[PDB]
């Protein structure tokens, strides 16, 4: 969601900001994001 710097969005103790989140890459299809659909790491499209 928009303007996250007001709030504190969490899924672990880590807050999910622009910087904590790795951007989703739809073409290269990294293996790390495939591991982290099982794990608890949030991923964004950078479109906002």
């Amino acid at each position: 969601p928009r303007n996250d710097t007001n709030a504190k969005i969490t899924a672990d103790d880590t807050p999910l900001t622009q910087n904590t989140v790795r951007v989703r890459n739809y073409e290269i299809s990294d293996v790390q994001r495939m591991n982290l659909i099982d794990s608890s790491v949030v991923f964004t499209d950078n479109d906002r």
Binding site: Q18, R22, V23, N25, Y26, E27, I28, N46
Partner: protein, 269 residues
């Protein structure tokens, strides 16, 4: 390892040397100096040059924006001293004891626009106050008053800030000679540091918008030439090179395009 196009061993070493020592030379503008862009070329006429040097300049502008975003120094370091002078001296003089003005007017002209002030009229109010403390009436010299031994040198400092916003120095106005003491030295440092802050921020925004405009410009001309062929490696290079870029995403895309330079050197026609 420092990815580039079909280049020689002299051009890669020279571009590595330039983008490493981007901080030491003055007038950092890549649009301004043409010794890099025209020379990062395969030669070979224009026929084999076009599509490959398009990718070469794409990597050059992209890595230029990367090293800018990595080598920016913090300007909040100078705005913290702006806040220290403006809060701790000038409010205590203008509102406390001497009180040559209104609490609301002076306090809110200092307090308003903590983030993103570009106002010259607030400065001009402090200039009129300082010159009223000074000898004369008019505002011919904005900054330091009573003395022009430092005026062209402070303008040289601001031009050097405009040239190299990555490496900047504070003038630190001289102690023994003064129009008056603590007050106009505080006002003087406040005006000079505010001008330095807005100068460095405008120069950074200029170079960031320039670099992003050049990268987005080269993406379209790259995609138009690469769109036509139908091999899998070709269309995968098309998708990798059509992934959208922002200045805050360019670092991750630089890592991605290294790991895809593993293939797309061979995917060129």
């Amino acid at each position: 390892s420092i990815p580039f196009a079909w280049l020689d061993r002299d051009k890669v070493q020279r571009l590595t040397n330039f983008l490493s020592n981007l901080e030491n030379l003055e007038n950092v503008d890549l649009r301004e100096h043409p010794y890099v862009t025209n020379s990062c070329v395969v030669r070979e006429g224009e026929d084999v040059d076009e599509l490959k040097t398009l990718y070469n300049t794409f990597i050059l502008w992209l890595m230029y924006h990367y090293v800018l975003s990595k080598r920016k120094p913090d300007y909040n370091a100078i705005w913290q001293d702006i806040t220290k002078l403006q809060n701790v001296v000038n409010e205590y003089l203008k509102s406390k004891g001497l009180n040559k003005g209104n609490f609301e007017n002076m306090f809110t002209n200092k307090e308003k626009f903590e983030s993103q002030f570009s106002d010259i009229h607030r400065a001009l109010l402090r200039l009129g106050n300082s010159i009223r403390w000074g000898s004369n009436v008019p505002i011919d010299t904005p900054y330091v008053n009573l003395t022009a031994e430092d005026s062209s040198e402070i303008e040289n400092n601001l031009q050097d800030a405009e040239k190299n916003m990555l490496w900047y120095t504070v003038y630190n106005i001289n102690d023994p000679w003064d129009e008056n003491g603590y007050l106009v030295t505080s006002i003087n440092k406040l005006v000079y540091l505010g001008k330095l802050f807005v100068t460095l921020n405008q120069s950074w925004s200029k170079l960031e918008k320039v670099a992003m405009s050049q990268i987005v410009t080269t993406q379209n001309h790259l995609s138009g030439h690469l769109r036509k062929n139908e091999n899998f490696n070709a269309v995968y290079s098309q998708r990798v090179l059509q992934t959208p870029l922002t200045g805050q995403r360019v670092e991750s895309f630089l890592k991605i395009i290294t790991s895809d330079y593993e293939i797309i050197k061979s995917s060129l026609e």
